[PDB]
Design a protein around this nucleic acid. Structure first.
Ligand code: FES
Lengths: 82, 101, 175, 46, 162, 130, 191
RNA sequence: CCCAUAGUAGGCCUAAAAGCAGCCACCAAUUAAGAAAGCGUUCAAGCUCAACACAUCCCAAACAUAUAA
């Protein structure tokens, strides 16, 4: 079975030094650079629940991808019988 | 692709599918190319190959097939449907396969 | 065919689960663990690494290594050792957006993204969806103080849930 | 307003109308005039 | 009309199609509004199984039916003509629209039972050994129900069961 | 039959048309190929090599492209598209890099390439590579 | 998502006997003809008594086939009250045009029709699964047939005027039924 | 008809649950492809679909086509 090493839990260290970010034994956790250096879009990423069709712009690729997923779901529900 | 894939290009040696894409009457030949170029149809005989060349001289699309014991078969796509070429082609190779073994 | 089974770095085992899989193919088993353990030597022993095996009909095998799963990155990035039992109702961990971006950076170097050939923005957009599955909430400006109280309560709550699980284990032994 | 048809590979090369018109004008111009023109063109390249 | 050919010469076979002129539709249909050929010519409900001149136009040289898309017939008329062609064949009205006989087959003479308005293929039908009582009598179908709407020039409607 | 009112264009249809209005703008050269029969694993490596050569392989329905070509200046592009089609785009003209990879797959034919805002046949495209 | 499932989605159990009349199954139903908080239902097209045995069959089938979260079912039939002496057993009379069972929730008629229609064929009387749109089309279609009927002679006109002394061979109830209902059996095609 | 790449084998549990004993989720890459609608697995895999592109012995005889009386 798969075994994972225990993660040391210090609040300051975890934020500054993520163990997961570093995968090699020789390397060390990657520190976080100032916020300004990081891309602005990172801060604009959506953290909320999946947007409904009304929220999404109608003429947008995501809107019709969401519409397509919903339509396939509708077929799934009908196909449940067989 | 499915139909031919069941048969397999065993007794064939090479194919030729010359067509001028600009010409309107090349639709049938290109559809024929898809079937023969199908991985399922081709994989059957890695040794066997296919030529699908492309030109812009205005020549009518032509399909020429190379075999071993069987004589070469040439089909002109301009006045042939893709299904008729495939079914007639499959019949020819089947007879050649019987002759070989 | 092709076999893609996640294997911990340097912990490849001839026995199950990957063991019997190789036996059916007929490819050498010991050779895999030998080459794999020697190829992931630098990587920490125990890192979830998706591995793809290119098996020819001749049974010749060419191993393929990828970047670790997103779960491992996010988990440690918060300090959490085990994800949440329930999603949306409890928060497993607290990671900044930076942490999601840092994982996206090193995670975009894998084979999957090369094929997916998407931009940097999409990379993060796909890791925020995994963190939610784990329960890990992302906050623009998390603070050490907030992190300390949140993690401490979760750890104690996880111990309480572990105690409930332990009680169920006793019932399972009874039945 | 519409792109011209691709020439056949066998067919001789076809040249845009503008290119053909320019060739005729160069011959009429004197070498001394051409020499003055040539000097300005070289500077633009570098 | 496209006739595929094949010529084996010089140890090679060439397959090519030949486009030939076809029979043009008669000019000025009486009712140009009609969607399909039958209504366009005021022929709806006005043709029977023995109108070979009308039915022959919608069948292949070997007696097979032509697709609806190619002919343009509406689904209702397509099924009517399809049944009429079946009865026309079974009655011997179309003796030149049969598959060509190759060299292998031998000319043979077998019982030629004259029949007409045959709804079912002779082989499939089974004898009516028990007719049954008068209130529940097993009848013998004659003609087709699809032609029940045909123009009737008599005070008695067609009997479809005998 | 009563003529039906014209069907409204789906938003996806507009999105596909909007994408086309950027392909030519973004990538100077767009190439058309027809053989999609190639296996997925070979296809994946083909795109991966294209990325190594800064080229992108994408497939779009001709249902929307065909009307656009009739309206766009490249009307002569329309005949090439038939059945299954795919597009290769690269802002920088990596013509030689593309051609040498296509040569490795005989059953995959390059119908034509629209480069430098000019419809060029495959035979002429080779000369351009040199 | 707007629809809300009650705390008890699956159909509740029906008592075999009450805790404590051939006309009952004859004619059009005057109650339970309209959907209540449910789009789909099983429409009774005939008149027959329902003993507990049927209730257990319908409840078992509907419950297992239906998904609790997706949809809910509400009983429209009361408990068996009529005494049948061979009391040997208790039954529930259902008149024609009555909705025996109703199905409402996050589902479509095609999804619902499958199990509802299957249960319907078991009922001792003719029944067909119906939906709001379907049932309204059924009633709207019936009204269209009456208005556009080309026959100048109708059962109601002949029966009400007693033309040909027809009332000698007809029941008094036929004046209200108008020939659509013959005993327990109901004839939909009749105008 | 066509064809179904993949994060990843989602988390949690499950000896085992890899779309698919269950639970919780049902987010996402691609122009597109349901954490999955079936079938199928010890679990996998495999196979389709939704997507992309394209009880002596039957019982009148008969009859379809001449203006309902
Ligand atoms: S549509 Fe008029 S007869 Fe076919």
């Amino acid at each position: 079975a798969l075994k994972d090493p225990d993660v040391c839990t210090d609040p300051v260290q975890l934020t500054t030094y993520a163990m997961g970010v570093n995968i090699y034994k020789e390397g060390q956790d990657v520190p976080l650079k100032p916020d300004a250096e990081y891309p602005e879009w990172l801060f604009e990423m959506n953290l909320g629940p999946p947007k409904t069709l009304e929220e999404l712009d109608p003429e947008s690729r995501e809107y019709w991808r969401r519409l397509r997923k919903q339509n396939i779901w509708r077929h799934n529900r009908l196909s449940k019988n067989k | 692709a499915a139909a031919l894939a069941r048969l397999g290009l065993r007794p064939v040696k090479q194919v030729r599918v010359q067509f001028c894409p600009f010409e309107k009457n090349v639709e049938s030949t290109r559809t024929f190319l898809q079937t023969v170029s199908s991985e399922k149809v081709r994989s059957t005989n890695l040794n066997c190959s296919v030529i699908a060349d492309v030109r812009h001289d205005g020549s009518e699309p032509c399909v020429d097939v190379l075999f071993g014991d069987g004589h070469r078969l040439i089909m002109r796509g301009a006045h042939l449907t893709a299904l008729e070429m495939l079914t007639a082609f499959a019949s020819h190779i089947r007879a050649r396969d019987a002759a070989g073994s | 065919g092709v076999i893609r089974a996640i294997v911990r770095a340097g912990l490849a085992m001839p026995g199950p689960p990957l063991g019997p899989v190789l036996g059916q193919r007929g490819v050498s088993i010991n050779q895999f663990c030998k080459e794999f353990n020697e190829r992931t030597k630098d990587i920490k022993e125990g890192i979830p690494l998706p591995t793809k095996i290119l098996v020819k009909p001749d049974r010749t095998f060419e191993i393929k290594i990828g970047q670790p799963t997103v779960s491992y990155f996010l988990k440690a990035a918060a300090g959490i050792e085990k994800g949440a039992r329930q999603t949306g109702k409890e928060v497993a961990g607290l990671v900044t957006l930076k942490h999601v971006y840092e994982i996206a950076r090193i995670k975009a170097q894998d084979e999957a993204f090369a094929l997916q050939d998407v931009p940097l923005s999409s990379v993060v957009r796909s890791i925020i969806g995994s963190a939610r599955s784990l329960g890990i909430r992302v906050v623009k400006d998390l603070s050490s103080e907030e992190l300390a109280a949140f993690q401490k309560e979760r750890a104690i709550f996880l111990a309480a849930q572990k105690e409930a699980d332990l009680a169920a284990q006793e019932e399972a032994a009874k039945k | 307003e519409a792109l011209a048809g691709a020439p056949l590979d066998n067919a001789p090369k076809e040249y845009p109308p503008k290119i053909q018109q320019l060739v005729q004008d160069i011959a009429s111009l004197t070498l001394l005039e051409i020499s003055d023109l040539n000097e300005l063109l070289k500077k633009t390249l570098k | 009309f496209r006739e595929v050919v094949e010529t084996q010469e010089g140890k090679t076979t060439i397959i090519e199609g030949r486009i030939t002129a076809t029979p043009k539709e008669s000019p000025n249909p009486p009712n140009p509004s009609g969607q399909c050929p039958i209504c366009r010519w005021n022929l709806k409900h006005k043709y029977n199984y023995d109108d070979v001149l009308l039915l022959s136009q919608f069948i292949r040289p070997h007696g097979g039916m032509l697709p609806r898309k190619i002919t343009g017939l509406c689904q209702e008329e397509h099924r009517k003509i399809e049944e009429c062609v079946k009865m026309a064949h079974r009655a011997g009205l179309l003796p030149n629209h049969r598959p060509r006989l190759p060299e292998g087959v031998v000319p043979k003479s077998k019982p030629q039972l004259n029949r007409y308005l045959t709804r079912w293929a002779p082989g499939s039908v089974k004898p009516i050994y028990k007719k049954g009582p008068r209130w529940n009598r097993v009848r013998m179908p004659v003609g087709s129900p699809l032609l029940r709407d045909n123009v009737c020039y008599s005070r008695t409607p067609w009997k479809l069961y005998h | 039959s009563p003529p039906s009112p014209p069907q409204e264009e789906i938003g996806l249809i507009r999105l596909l048309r909007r994408e086309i209005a950027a392909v030519f703008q973004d990538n100077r050269m767009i190439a058309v190929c027809q053989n999609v029969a190639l296996s997925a694993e070979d296809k994946l490596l083909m795109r991966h090599q294209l990325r190594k050569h800064k080229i992108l392989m994408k497939v779009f329905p001709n249902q929307v492209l065909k009307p656009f070509l009739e309206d766009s200046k490249y009307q002569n592009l329309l005949p090439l598209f038939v059945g299954h089609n795919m597009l290769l785009v690269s802002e920088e003209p990596k013509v030689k890099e593309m051609v040498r990879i296509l040569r490795t797959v005989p059953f995959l034919p390059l119908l034509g390439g629209c480069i430098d805002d000019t419809i060029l046949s495959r035979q002429g495209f080779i000369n351009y590579s040199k | 998502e707007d629809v809300s499932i009650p705390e008890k989605p699956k159909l509740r159990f029906i008592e075999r006997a009450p805790l404590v009349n051939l006309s009952d199954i004859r004619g059009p139903s005057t109650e339970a003809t309209e959907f209540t908080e449910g789009n789909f239902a099983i429409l009774a097209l005939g008149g027959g008594y329902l003993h507990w045995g049927h209730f257990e069959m319908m409840r078992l089938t509907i419950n297992r086939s239906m998904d609790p979260k997706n949809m809910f079912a509400i009983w429209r039939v009361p408990a068996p009250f009529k005494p049948i002496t061979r009391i040997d057993h208790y039954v529930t009379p259902v008149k024609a045009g009555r909705l025996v069972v109703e199905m409402g929730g996050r589902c479509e008629f095609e999804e619902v029709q499958g199990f509802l229609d299957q249960v319907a064929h078991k009922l001792p009387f003719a029944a067909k699964a119906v939906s709001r749109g379907t049932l309204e089309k059924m009633r709207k279609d019936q009204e269209e047939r009456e208005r556009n009927n080309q026959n100048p002679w109708t059962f109601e006109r002949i029966a009400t005027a007693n033309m040909l002394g027809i009332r000698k061979v007809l029941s008094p109830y036929d004046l209200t039924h108008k020939g659509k209902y013959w005993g327990k059996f109901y004839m939909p095609k009749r105008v």
